[PDB]
Write a protein that binds this ligand. Structure first.
Ligand SMILES: [Fe+3]
Ligand SMILES: [Fe+3]
Ligand SMILES: [Fe+3]
Ligand SMILES: [Fe+3]
Ligand SMILES: [Zn+2]
Ligand SMILES: [Zn+2]
Lengths: 190, 190
């Protein structure tokens, strides 16, 4: 059926509004992680910002109407150091998949919108991996393990693809001469 | 010392010219992999194109002069299906780290340019991982293993970050409704 005048109609707009602000906050956090010397984290923030654009797009494509009043609480700010930014983003993520989307998928079901309840539950799966990624990175920073491990691995320069073998990323990449900030652990996922 | 009138001077320009064309070919190949339904491969081509920009930048920053004549053979074309594109790119990669850069680093040494011989040898390391990545992907296509494995894993939608558990990627992502083409094996490298 129609969406107009349901509680799910107001919940889709609230989810779109919260996601639109998260897209912006993650891009801002992405800029600050670049300035903190964490390029791989900067790009994860930007990738996540982008994924928030897409969850907000799927939601928005259900809406059919005009103006709608929302009552809702949002984080009133703060761009801090990258560790705090990672912790505040895991928290926001945390609330979405444990509270907001559960609740919204449940109301959609009650109202006869099973396909939207489906989409709401499916976004939550994505929101869980995002929180886990922010938490592992926050933990790496705090322990001082971003650029140095206990056992020797392969480190890749994200700027030129140079692979380095060692316990830690070199101070400057020898191929492109960009600093340590550009290195990540080498990953293979094919 | 100065670079002008050395064989290394002509070799840096030849390497810059070959890399500049590889940046373009990998971006073209990147567009065709998108049309073939391989988004993760499309983005690796684009990432590699970008890394070729940076190797070419480090090289170019050594040059000091005016015009210089190059005699050199280059691939005179062809944008084909993605598998052939992956095989032709591994080959080009292959020739760079086994023949071109070895030889150029060796001549630079002979001539008293040890730091450029250093940079030439270091780019080759990057060129080896690029060939290995193109070959594993070409092999995945050919065996039909891009979107389906024999044992059950976790598949991630690159468009919205939805994580799926199964032997194969779903036909449409349930969170963003984008097709199979968007999925990759879930990777963790932190
Ligand atoms: Fe999220
Ligand atoms: Fe580098
Ligand atoms: Fe390469
Ligand atoms: Fe998706
Ligand atoms: Zn979200
Ligand atoms: Zn190259």
């Amino acid at each position: 059926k129609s969406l107009k005048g349901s509680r799910t109609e107001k919940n889709i707009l609230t989810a779109f509004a919260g996601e639109s602000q998260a897209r912006n906050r993650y891009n801002y956090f992405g800029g600050q992680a670049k300035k903190d010397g964490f390029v791989q984290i900067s790009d994860i923030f930007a990738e996540t910002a982008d994924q928030e654009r897409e969850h907000a797009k799927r939601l928005f494509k259900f809406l059919e109407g005009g103006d709608l009043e929302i009552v809702a609480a949002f984080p009133a700010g703060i761009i801090a150091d990258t560790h705090a930014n990672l912790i505040a983003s895991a928290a926001g993520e945390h609330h979405e998949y444990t509270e907001m989307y559960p609740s919204f998928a449940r109301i959609a079901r009650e109202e006869g919108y099973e396909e939207i309840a489906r989409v709401f539950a499916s976004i939550a799966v994505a929101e869980e991996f995002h929180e886990k990624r922010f938490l592992d990175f926050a933990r790496n920073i705090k322990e001082g393990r971003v650029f140095l491990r206990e056992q020797a691995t392969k480190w890749r320069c994200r700027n030129c693809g140079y692979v380095h073998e060692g316990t830690g990323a070199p101070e400057l990449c020898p191929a492109c001469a960009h600093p340590k900030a550009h290195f990540e652990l080498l990953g293979i996922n094919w």
